[PDB]
Design a protein around this nucleic acid. Structure first.
Ligand code: SAH
Length: 568
DNA sequence: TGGGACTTTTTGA
DNA sequence: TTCAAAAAGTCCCA
């Protein structure tokens, strides 16, 4: 028997990293391909419909299409005599199965000419006369005028973010795919739209994509399109598990249909242990039914713009917290992203760097990283930011410009606002407002394994890897920073935030304002005790010679208080 | 070479 | 004028 994943693996090894990233050339492993193909084609009635059109618009070398060929050959061979009796007796013979499949059943598209030729040769070599016409298109699937729809669509689209995509192509996507593609969206949104649009009535689509669109702000329109145009049959969420070897992406498998049905429920399989060697096991189907995965059902008609895919216990937990809390962080706080210098090496220096003797302390700010943020407090800053925006006189401070900032001048000149003349070559790209940072505030890392909200007492500045917020004046008498960090750092709120948080990679969640500011908060009779416990924790943490042991006990007591307050 | 600590600036709006 | 989102992440080693 043939190894359908050998020539494709060799072609993958031939390419380098840049050409892979520019076109998203990362082929799917055999276990996922087997699961998707057998999920779509296990129950096909080949006698009822012996002309199923099965498409992969990103076929590549044909990881999906060769397995599809094998499944189709078995299907036809098992019912050849029934097909012979029901239809033309001379057309339906075993020796004619091959020519039939390639003529009517397998369709592939890809921009990669060499991959198309390799797949064509692989399809031809499935059998050892007239040259059979193989339905392989070398084209941009997002520009191709498709002349007919398809019974089944399987595959893996390219993933290209908003930085790696060309300007003109992005303009085309915004003009023609505006239903799913805006702002910081991804190309696989457009591939989702194209797959849905050319799926026949009653057809089935099943693809593996990144999982980020399930929760991300950019995926809202795509989620609406999917919810309103297809019936989502199944969502397999791998969370931070590594499905693609040596690839830093988080994957989900999605199966949907356009069948006219009153059924509106979705099977959701969510992995429970992200430390799993998926390729070690024989099938994905056995893994889904094991204890490594949990299964629940979600009513698609009950999906809002946010898809909250949790089991009944977590849904009850989330609903209790939502109903009890009358305020959100957005209601009471002002949030902002950190400084974006545009070139950190030019403006960020070690606080022991000798070059800081050239810079007057009026221009120097304390600089912290995401790892400097712990629970309730921030580590002492190790770095200084040169707030070069306040260097108005270019004639003076020429030592600073020539010996520190100018060492990267060329790179500083390639920033967007310098090319347009908005910024001077030595200025910060996005210097924000100094007064927002130089005050008591709360800071949290932009990516973390857990809630880490700290009170900043030292007017620390930061890059965009740290987000900040401060309480509005009108809400200062109702909420204090100590109480806020007390409740936000609790295990209750850790779980509550992770209910809807954007899962990025293994043990990493996105902590961005678009979801952090939606966290709801409460105040009740337990306010004083929670605030007092938080202040005790802060006092213990700030002592130079101290042990963190009692902090855990205080945290347990505070978690008990919060659970009592929220009735969970 | 797979697992863990850590996270820049480009970009549309 | 100036906000904030975005992992086919990056990068190192035992
Ligand atoms: N605009 C476009 N139209 C069609 N195919 C494209 C495309 N942009 C990228 N591709 C192709 O999409 C493929 C994604 S890699 C996945 C290949 C295959 N489906 C598998 O799972 O193994 C790449 O081979 C790339 O060449």
């Amino acid at each position: 028997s043939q190894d359908n994943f050998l020539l494709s693996k060799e072609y993958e090894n031939s390419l380098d990293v840049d050409t892979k990233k520019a076109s998203g050339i990362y082929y799917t492993p055999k276990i996922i391909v087997d699961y998707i193909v057998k999920k779509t084609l296990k129950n096909h009635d080949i006698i009822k419909n012996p002309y199923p059109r099965i498409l992969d618009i990103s076929c590549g070398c044909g990881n999906f299409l060769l397995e599809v060929y094998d499944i189709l050959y078995d299907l036809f061979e098992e019912n050849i005599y029934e097909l012979k009796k029901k239809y033309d007796e001379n057309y339906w013979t075993v020796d004619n199965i091959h020519r039939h499949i390639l003529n009517y059943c397998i369709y592939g598209a890809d921009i990669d000419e060499k991959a198309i030729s390799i797949l064509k040769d692989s399809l031809t070599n499935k059998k050892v006369e007239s040259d059979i016409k193989i339905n392989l298109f070398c084209c941009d699937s997002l520009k191709k005028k498709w002349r007919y729809k398809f019974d089944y669509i399987v595959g893996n689209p390219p993933y290209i973010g908003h930085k790696k995509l060309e300007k003109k192509y992005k303009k085309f996507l915004l003009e023609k795919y505006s239903e799913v593609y805006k702002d910081k969206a991804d190309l696989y949104f457009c591939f989702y739209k194209k797959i849905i649009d050319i799926l026949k009535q009653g057809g089935i689509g099943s693809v593996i994509t990144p999982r980020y669109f399930l929760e991300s702000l950019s995926g809202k329109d795509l989620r609406e399109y999917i919810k309103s145009n297809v019936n989502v049959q199944e969502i397999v969420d791998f969370l931070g598990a590594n499905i693609f070897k040596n690839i830093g992406v988080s994957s989900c498998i999605l199966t949907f249909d356009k069948k006219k049905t009153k059924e509106t429920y979705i099977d959701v399989f969510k992995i429970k242990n992200e430390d799993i060697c998926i390729n070690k096991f024989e099938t994905l189907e056995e893994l889904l039914k094991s204890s490594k995965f949990e299964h629940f059902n979600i009513n698609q008609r009950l999906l809002s713009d946010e898809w909250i895919l949790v089991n009944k216990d977590d849904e009850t937990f989330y609903n209790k917290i939502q109903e009890k809390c009358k305020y959100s962080l957005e209601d009471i706080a002002i949030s902002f992203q950190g400084i974006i210098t545009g070139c950190d090496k030019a403006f960020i220096l070690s606080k022991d760097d000798v070059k800081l003797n050239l810079v007057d302390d009026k221009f120097l700010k304390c600089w912290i990283k995401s790892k400097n943020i712990n629970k309730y407090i921030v580590d002492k800053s190790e770095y200084r930011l040169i707030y070069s925006n306040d260097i108005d006189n270019e004639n003076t401070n020429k030592r600073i410009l020539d010996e520190i900032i100018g060492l990267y001048k060329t790179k500083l000149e390639n920033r967007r606002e310098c090319k347009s003349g908005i910024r001077k070559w030595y200025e910060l790209q996005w210097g924000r407002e100094k007064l927002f940072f130089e005050r008591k505030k709360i800071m949290y890392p932009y990516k973390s394994n857990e809630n880490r909200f700290a009170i900043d007492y030292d007017n620390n500045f930061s890059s965009a890897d740290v987000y900040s917020f401060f309480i509005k004046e009108e809400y200062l008498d109702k909420f204090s920073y100590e109480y806020l960090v007390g409740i936000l750092n609790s295990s209750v709120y850790d779980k509550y935030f992770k209910i809807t948080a954007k899962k990025m990679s293994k043990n990493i969640y996105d902590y961005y304002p678009n979801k952090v500011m939606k966290i709801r908060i409460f105040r009740d009779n337990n306010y004083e005790e929670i605030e007092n416990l938080s202040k005790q924790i802060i006092s213990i943490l700030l002592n130079k010679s101290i042990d963190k042991g009692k902090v855990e006990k205080l945290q347990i007591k505070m978690d008990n208080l919060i659970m009592d307050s929220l009735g969970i």
